[PDB]
Structure formats: C-alpha cells, structure tokens
C-alpha cells in the first residue's frame with residue numbers, strides 16, 4: 001500500500017534522525033525496496049527514472065547522508081569503485097567474474113568466529129600486536145556456471 | 147634464490163591444500179613466479195620446454211587442479227579464449243582502521259577449505275549454479291594495539 005510504504009520510509013528516516021523530505025522518502029523506498037549494490041551513477045539513474053526533476057547534486061547529498069546514518073552501507077570492491085548496499089545486516093559477498101554481478105552470502109556464526117579468532121592469532125604472531133574490536137569482510141570471486 | 151622459490155611455491159600449494167610433488171613445485175614456480183596470462187597451449191609449451199618428460203595429460207591435470215583451487219585465475223574472454231592468470235593474491239589482510247595501514251595475514255588451509263566449502267554450497271543452493279575457480283579474500287578490520 002502507498003500509505004504503508006510512506007509510513008515505512010518515514011520510520012526508517014526518523015529512526016536514523018534524518019529530516020523528512022519527499023525526495024528522501026522516495027529514495028528510501030527506491031533504494032531499500034530490494035537488496036542491491038549500486039554505484040553513485042546507478043543510484044542517480046534509478047532515482048532520476050522516478051523523479052526526473054530531482055537534481056544530481058540533491059540525490060548525491062541524500063545518498064551521502066544515507067551512508068553516514070547507516071541506512072545504506074558503503075561497499076568498496078578491489079578496483080576503487082564504491083557501491084551502496086541496501087542490505088545493512090552483516091553479510092559477505094560472492095562476485096560472478098563473468099558478469100560482475102554481486103550476491104549477498106552469509107557464513108554460519110560459529111565458523112565465522114573461528115575464522116575471526118584464527119586470523120587475530122595470525123595477526124598477533126606476525127606483528128606482535130593484537131587487533132581489537134574486529135569486523136570480518138569476505139569476498140568469494142568465481143565464475144558462475146551456468 | 148632457488149631456496150626461496152621452492153619455499154614460496156611450497157606455501158602456495160599447501161595454503162591451497164594441494165599435495166606437493168616436484169612437478170607441481172616446478173609448475174607453480176614457472177606459472178606463478180611472474181605476472182602473466184597464458185592460454186592452455188602456451189602453458190603446455192612453457193612447462194614442456196622445462197620439463198620435457200612431463201606428459202600433456204599430467205600438465206593439464208595440474209593446470210586444471212591449480213584453477214580448481216584458485217592458485218591461477220581464469221580470464222574467460224568474451225571471444226571464447228581462456229587465459230590462465232598468475233596475478234593472484236595468495237594471502238589475506240588485516241587493516242588498522244585507525245591508520246589505514248594494511249598487514250598480510252594467512253588462514254590455516256583446513257579452515258579455508260571449510261569456509262570455501264560452505265560458501266560454495268550456499269551459492270549453489272541460492273542460485274542453482276556452481277561457482278568455479280574460486281578465490282576467497284578476507285579482510286579483518288580493527289584497532290591495532292599497541
């Protein structure tokens with residue numbers, strides 16, 4: 001429902017302490033409707049298709065605000081490109097090298113903690129220092145067949 | 147050094163969980179000592195020149211194993227040509243979130259194999275396709291103390 005989507009985007013912006021505007025409500029709805037990973041230009045293309053009178057600058061400033069407030073997450077790929085991820089729950093990524101397509105993937109918590117622990121021990125062995133308040137990010141790159 | 151090239155190749159294979167043999171150490175050294183991209187026939191030409199008693203079948207089985215374990219990356223060109231790329235990072239990274247400094251770190255092979263195994267299975271379940279020639283990249287981000 002159109003009443004529901006407005007109420008849902010209003011709460012997302014308010015919970016994050018973002019001042020509500022029509023453009024921000026539309027952007028929250030368009031970006032957070034489905035799990036996706038978009039460059040700044042792809043965000044502009046998406047928003048521009050639904051709101052052709054919104055300026056590139058205003059869309060870019062809202063996108064930066066959304067990333068600062070954690071309603072989208074910044075994802076950098078090994079090339080310098082920055083992607084805006086609409087899935088904010090902790091997850092990893094598989095990339096199909098044939099198409100460049102990105103898939104969200106998760107790791108079982110026990111296994112993830114074993115990886116995090118072994119890597120912290122190897123860091124300590126190699127540097128003599130401990131790594132504190134750690135987060136783990138994994139990328140699996142391969143060729144999707146078919 | 148001949149000692150260093152043997153040690154470097156031995157670690158690459160062991161990290162990937164490949165059983166060490168003299169032929170595999172020579173192939174790992176010939177393919178991975180320098181950045182290059184070669185077709186299957188150029189790999190055979192290169193290996194055959196240094197190991198003329200190695201059969202085409204043994205060379206191609208090792209090349210397929212190397213691609214299966216991600217120690218060589220396939221470049222699958224749109225023209226249908228497949229190249230075997232030695233420009234692979236065979237370790238992981240810890241990043242000191244304060245300074246931005248990056249440290250090389252490694253994961254035990256058995257544990258790396260369990261992570262790839264679980265992720266590949268989940269990828270297959272979710273997409274219906276398998277991910278081939280995988281390379282896992284892990285980044286551990288934290289505060290270095292001291």
Ligand SMILES: [K+]
Nearest residue numbers: 219279280281
């Ligand atoms: K790969």
Ligand SMILES: [Zn+2]
Nearest residue numbers: 037085087104
């Ligand atoms: Zn994601």
Ligand SMILES: [Zn+2]
Nearest residue numbers: 237239249250
């Ligand atoms: Zn490195």
